Design a protein around this ligand. Structure first.
Ligand SMILES: Nc1ccn([C@@H]2O[C@H](COP(=O)(O)OP(=O)(O)OP(=O)(O)O)[C@@H](O)[C@H]2O)c(=O)n1
Ligand SMILES: Nc1ccn([C@@H]2O[C@H](COP(=O)(O)OP(=O)(O)OP(=O)(O)O)[C@@H](O)[C@H]2O)c(=O)n1
Ligand SMILES: [Mg+2]
Ligand SMILES: [Mg+2]
Lengths: 468, 467
């Protein structure tokens, strides 16, 4: 019965006691771990390729990090010419390169990126059914245990800067990184949450802060500067402080992730939890999202830069809606969750009741037995013939409703009164989605699967994951 | 039996290390406060001073007493929750007390010049006058403790990002020539069987120079002082100067400060000047009075420019004292010869070695009174040939000028560096004029008759403007 909030805490606690070691060219796995173990017990570890062999070490005790740091030196080779900020990024070399005294064995490399689309298409064609195809993609794309540990670590490193002056700060991931829908190679979205008996009243002297937004801008501005200059391995630091939600984008060389740092927004975190739930409730949920996400990227309906396009988040929200409207529903409405919540799970933010259940056992498993074969096609059919001018998507009620605005695509932000999450989406783009969906359905409906396999040509999911 | 500069520094820092600052209540009971505080630990020293309210410095005998006190201190229930050694004490029930006896206030600034002039006139001889000024101006024990503390706080603050930092004062603050109200010059310095088969080290960015890193470290610390650190204002990032710098005002101790990254050449100066000042009271006496003289006659200025700097002026005075018969202080080379391998320091190519122990130096036989030395100083430099000669403190001799600057003073720890390169002809000439006027007055003045008149005499006669 592991709640999102539970899982997050354990993950953070583990990344908290983890480090990164750039390995020697000729690496002896055993001698390394044997050595390191001297500083403390090791719960987990793995190796990955990134401009050389790096290795993530997760000690059982946080004290092991101090222990290891205690015997780590500053590069005297390059001595006064560096910024002497110490963190958990280490570089190991052999004292005596000519004292190599055991058999060189290779090391297992955990992959941190997924295969390209073109490499995937063949594998999909050799599958049996569509269900299989979708589940292949899912597996080939989803985040690995190692990848996750690596994401949480990246957050943990960024935190360490914040604590300098807000000891109680936390850097926590949200979005795809933690909501079960993360594909390999995605960005790590980080939220900085910073504040959280004599005859005398004795008090610390402490410098006052400005307004929420103005302080936010300054804290991020300074952290940004530190990432850049105390580093190491932070590049393309981009201070985008003036947006609706102040932001620092940056590229982290050691973990390979590009990242987005912003100050805690508890509305966005509740989304990520809600999506965490849905994803956990049924594998069909995840399967669909991943495939339809890929579909969208393939047909240029989505884009890595913001704009008039649909965002994966909105698209994900549309999919959740779709799954709410099954007979019977595959996932419950948000209100159905709110009803099952106890006082423990009561959260009310910015006026609006963002309450819903945390324990998954409280929810009744779905009776629905639809295969993905159907759900994939039905999705295209459903939205292909959806009346976007007359209707909007409400995930609280799980019903089509009247539009409180005159935007082309309106999706009810579930944790705000009166907010369109697809407000950015224009008519031209929406129309292309509908076209692409209607083409996609038509193909799936009127295609000869058995005969396409025989011809070696694409079919099912593959037929809609190639451009038209 | 005296102690090395390096010794004294360490003991001072160690004491400031276990000290805090308490903003006191309006109605303050000295006894109840100390009685209370003593519960957390034994108290070696303490004092009170006025600065936008009554503040108090408490030096515990144990560093553990600071933790003890912090353990019962709350956050003001907004703010940047950086916890340090700045506390604010108030009464639970203000209006049920009555309690306030007065308190003794250690003064952190010296009296103005105009208040000093009378006191100087009522003295007996010039020696006395110079020693009065010295005392009225020099740093008090309390003031010093307060300076070291200021450094200690910045260290703790720096340690937030660089756990292995030290912040150490240099310059007038520690070289024995500090007058009250002067800036605290801080140097940020970084300093810290093998079991395995690996050489393990940190991943850190390679920057082209030491200078470029220095600029970034200070830039970021500066920003933090400004936005996070308590009681830091007027932060001025002056990163591009010869020695990158952050100036800032520390409200609690009242000091304006100057943060820079450790420069070991500047520290050796401070030690050298520490030595000279310690060797003889005449040394200090002279410097303080002539420093004041210069300020009075606008030969020096608080902003940089074509003026002479107190440092250069101090260097000229040291030179003057080297050229006595017999010398009052030894040359720098005379010190270098008395240094052991223990005191060998060689930085940036140049041998900056000299003795640390003062007993190794033979006490000066010279017995000249200040009466003479003050006048002689004006005479000496009044008739000095600045166009043909330069001041070398290593040799203690006038030498040919390696450049064609008007006033050339050999930087003792560098190669071909003029410390008074900034000084132009017009300004130099005004110094010489002022010196020659100053000497003439002292030489041809009727001391006894000026006292009878009530008008100024001796040091006072040269510490009033010539309008
Ligand atoms: N209009 C929006 C957009 C985003 N968010 C929140 O901010 C997060 C960050 O956005 P994004 O990174 O696009 O979400 P991901 O699901 O991480 O998308 P992707 O798979 O493309 O990384 C979202 O997850 C969501 O919780 C929101 O509340 N309202
Ligand atoms: N041309 C110069 C100027 C300054 N310094 C060094 O910078 C240090 C600090 O400079 P400053 O604070 O100006 O010296 P103080 O004697 O502290 O000046 P003041 O009496 O005005 O406080 C000095 O110890 C000196 O070694 C130097 O080496 N060469
Ligand atoms: Mg993202
Ligand atoms: Mg100074």
């Amino acid at each position: 019965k592991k709640t999102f909030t539970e899982v997050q805490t354990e993950r953070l606690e583990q990344a908290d006691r983890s480090v990164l070691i750039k390995c020697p060219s000729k690496l002896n796995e055993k001698k390394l771990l044997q050595y390191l173990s001297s500083h403390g017990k090791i719960d987990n570890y793995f190796f990955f390729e990134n401009r050389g062999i790096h290795a993530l070490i997760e000690f059982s005790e946080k004290s092991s990090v101090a222990s290891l740091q205690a015997v780590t030196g500053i590069p005297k080779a390059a001595e006064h010419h560096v910024v002497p900020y110490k963190s958990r990024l280490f570089t190991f070399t052999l004292k005596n390169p000519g004292s190599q005294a055991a058999e060189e064995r290779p090391v297992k490399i955990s992959p941190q990126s997924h295969i390209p689309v073109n490499e995937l298409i063949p594998k999909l064609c050799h599958a049996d059914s569509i269900s299989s195809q979708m589940y292949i993609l899912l597996n080939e794309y989803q985040l690995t245990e190692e990848n996750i540990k690596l994401r949480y670590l990246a957050c943990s490193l960024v935190r360490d800067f914040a604590r300098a002056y807000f000891p109680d700060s936390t850097v926590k991931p949200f979005g795809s990184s933690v909501n079960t829908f993360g594909k390999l190679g995605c960005d790590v979205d980080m939220f900085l949450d910073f504040h959280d008996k004599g005859p005398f009243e004795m008090e610390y002297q402490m410098k006052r802060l400005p307004s929420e937004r103005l302080a936010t801008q300054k804290i991020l501005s300074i952290i940004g500067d530190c990432l850049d200059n105390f580093g190491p391995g932070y590049s393309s630091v981009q201070k985008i402080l003036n947006a609706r939600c102040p932001l620092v984008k940056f590229s982290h060389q050691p973990t390979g992730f590009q990242c987005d740092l912003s100050v805690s927004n508890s509305i966005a975190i509740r989304c990520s939890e809600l999506l965490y739930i849905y994803g956990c409730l049924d594998p069909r949920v995840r399967a669909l999202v991943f495939s339809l996400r890929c579909w969208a990227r393939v047909h240029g309906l989505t884009n890595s830069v913001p704009g008039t396009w649909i965002t994966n988040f909105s698209l994900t929200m549309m999919i959740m809606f779709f799954l709410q409207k099954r007979s019977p529903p595959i996932i419950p409405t948000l209100d159905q969750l709110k009803e099952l919540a106890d006082e423990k799970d009561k959260h009310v933010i910015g006026g609006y009741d963002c309450s819903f259940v945390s324990d998954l056992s409280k929810i009744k498993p779905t009776k629905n037995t639809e295969t993905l074969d159907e759900l994939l096609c039905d999705f295209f059919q459903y939205f292909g013939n959806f009346d976007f001018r007359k209707n909007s998507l409400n995930l609280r009620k799980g019903k089509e409703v009247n539009k409180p605005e005159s935007s082309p695509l309106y999706i009810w932000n579930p944790f705000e009164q009166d907010l369109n999450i697809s407000k950015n989406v224009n008519q031209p783009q929406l129309e292309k989605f509908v076209a692409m969906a209607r083409e996609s359905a038509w193909i799936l409906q009127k295609e000869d699967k058995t005969q396409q396999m025989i011809n070696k040509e694409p079919w099912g999911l593959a037929a809609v994951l190639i451009p038209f």
